[model samples]
Target: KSLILPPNEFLDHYILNAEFHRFAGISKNAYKFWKNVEIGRYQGTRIIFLHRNCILEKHQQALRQCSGLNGFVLASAFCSFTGLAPSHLVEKNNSSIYKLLELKEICGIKFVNLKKFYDFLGLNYHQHIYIEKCHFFSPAPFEKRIKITESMCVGYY
Candidate 1:
């Protein structure tokens, strides 16, 4: 269903060889330290468009604790890391499913409305695989926003 791209010295080698456009999903976890600029650069080329979930401040810090990634750069580089303008906020008027999911605290996963994502890529929507309710709450922190990428190559969770 997806390809795994680990952040390592050889990461570039894997990226260059993969047929990234054909995949249905991609996931990158605990990879915020590599360089936000590189992800930013991909935006201009139509290779990726970033979407950031509006997680409350403390929740972000809790994630870092669990992931053990000390750098946790989203606070300082939040806007640059996102493909959309920093001032942008999600509109509540789109798909009906968008309305079904309450957009309150801890919209970590299911907040994504994949219709926009599939439409952007010019691919046929596959409801069987992509459609589902996504939500999660953590003992530490839970509220608002997570990131998703448009292209199959790079994504964040």
Candidate 2:
């Protein structure tokens, strides 16, 4: 259900689809990041998200013609999935939308829950975006592209 979002929407219209800006604001942070590094390119940086000055702030940093991942990726790269995680779907002790850690542990599950859709990524979260030698967009597949994790929806991730 890839409903179209308004072109004027802040998340997609501005950040995800945006590239170079004189004052662009972004943060790439996470515990352990996994991106396809390329030849002759610098690693990505981290941008902090604030309630205000978000849009204008991004417009300030005009490094390249385009940008890559943001806080959203780092935030979702944890075991606390809102739906896909059994602890998230079944457990009810502290089953809140904010923090939902997975049970004992799962191999790949501990990594970024590709099923999660986080426009803002996460808080206190950190990740690094891979920048190629000559590219603007991230080469990694979109998190929503995976239909297997439709059961997992939006959360604080």
Candidate 3:
């Protein structure tokens, strides 16, 4: 397969942990993803990498994916949240991502409530998760976002 360091949190529910590295490109000689992200538990932070080319229903079933660890941060790209069929839509390539986050009347998107995300995982948010509009891209508005800290990529983090 085509990827790097083990993802602290994987967004795909179908793949088992043993086979994750191989399919995700963490296998030796495959393409490596240039980003390493963190998933916080005590802080109640949820993250997702928006696993590229992965199907939405698969990702939605993410909470149940972990064989070792789990988190719903969705450290993923916001484009996936638009709920549109996967589109390699690119506005000059990488910058295409900036569009979804831009100020506009975005539609056809299905938003996920962090509360419900934890619910599906059979967890309680009071001791675990929270987020808001201001905290969408940045760290938590009140608590500050936590950084993943243990891998390499994204300038490649």
Candidate 4:
């Protein structure tokens, strides 16, 4: 059901109004096309996240914006696509939030997963931010290459 707004409503107040342009070009019948594309992409990303055991992190404020009604709408659309009921209906106290580090590792391990994730969230490829501020021990590569064999280890007997 579409949420109703008072007459002379500012588009900023509507969630659809905010995200519609980000997904597609605006033109005649653009709204319908954009809506279908948005819903499909959203569902696809949700499925990938669930299948890969992703947990939304608390620090992801952007995603948090879609946590309540917007989240439900996405989940519902996903359920329709997969023909299965959504199981992890997150709530206030029972939020399925993931740690930032864990999410980073998951993305590193699965490039495709991360691609779908970013696409579904309407985030630009370059907009996905990661901070690498940290200290780590440095090791030099071996100056010479050596191949080890079982016989070589036996004192050349």
Candidate 5:
């Protein structure tokens, strides 16, 4: 007789093969150093952007503290090292759960929503996912005064 499983109760496992060996070789010391550097640079960049846009100093600082570069880089690297190419990361935002499952099936590891994970760990969103939510600002005046720049939102893995 065959057994059925619940939709969300599927079994998950890992296999350390030649493809997954890259992550296995990620030295703890190297990761630690890179992480710090990445976080510093990431916060610095976000602060610069916020200031350049004339955002409030307090808000900019809050954003900088929340969105660390190291976490983004590390997560991307983890995805890449496990063979989830840039395309997978790009499509992730379309549907988080489906994309995560796809990544896991391809890489033999779980792909988490980094922001949610950070929040779960009690970290501030500003220090974790630091994107501007300019909804509070009246865009009409700003649009009339400033030639708002537009660009495609691309994901880099």
Candidate 6:
């Protein structure tokens, strides 16, 4: 199911380097806002909030607008070509949300168990948007979208 986060709520996504403050082409005000409210540290990077839609497009666009065009694209292509797992889904143990969802360590990453998550939140899963597979492409990396089964994670990226 596609998750429609409430307009008032936010989800955690990450950006690698904060020093490049202009990375997103987002407003200076937005950058200041992110710095003010960011959830601290994924490895070493701060967690920035993101809209449910077009999450990775911002990162991909930023790469195009900033440095490392070939670097990111090559990494993305290599990952796709080898069928390596998506880089965006971090280790389940790396974050607390994994525990919150009571997610199993399938593929050694945190894929949300929506029913468990909604049950814990006391929200109706069906009332919100649902997506079977969410794409988090860096560029034209994947030939086809990854198939998301009940055991697979979708929106974490």
Q: Which candidate is the best by TM-score?
A: 6
Backbone clash pairs for candidate 1 read 53-145, 53-146, 54-144, 54-145, 55-144, 105-143, 106-142, 106-143, 110-134
Weakest lDDT window of 10 consecutive positions for candidate 5: 43-52
The C-alpha TM-scores of every prediction are 0.17, 0.19, 0.18, 0.18, 0.20, 0.22
Please report how far candidate 2 places residue 141 from its true position, in Å.
36
Find the number of clashing residue pairs for candidate 3.
Answer: 24
Model 3 RMSD, rounded to 1 decimal: 17.5
Put the candidates in lDDT order, highest first: 6, 3, 5, 2, 1, 4
Candidate 1, after superposition: displacement of residue 49 in Å?
22
Q: lDDT score, residue 87, model 1?
A: 29
Error in Å for residue 88 of model 2: 18
State which candidate has the highest lDDT: 6
Q: What is the lDDT for 83 in model 4? A: 34
- Runs of candidate 6 with Cα error greater than 4 angstroms are 1-89, 105-111, 129-157
Q: Write the per-residue lDDT of candidate 5 for residues 1-157, one digit (tens) a residue.
A: 1122111111221111212223334333332332222211122111111111322343344333332222222234333333334443555456332333233222332333444333443545343122112342334654222211131111112
The superposed Cα distance between candidate 4 and the true structure at residue 8, in angstroms, equals 32
Query: 111, model 5: CA deviation in Å?
Result: 11
> What would the per-residue lDDT of candidate 6 be over residues 43-83, giving only the tens digit for each residue?
22223323223334445666344322111112222223223
lDDT of 3 at 94: 48
In candidate 4, position 126 carries an lDDT of 39
Task: State each model's CA lDDT, in order.
Answer: 0.26, 0.27, 0.29, 0.26, 0.28, 0.33
CA RMSD for every model?
18.9, 18.8, 17.5, 19.4, 19.9, 16.7
Better of 5 and 6 by TM-score: 6
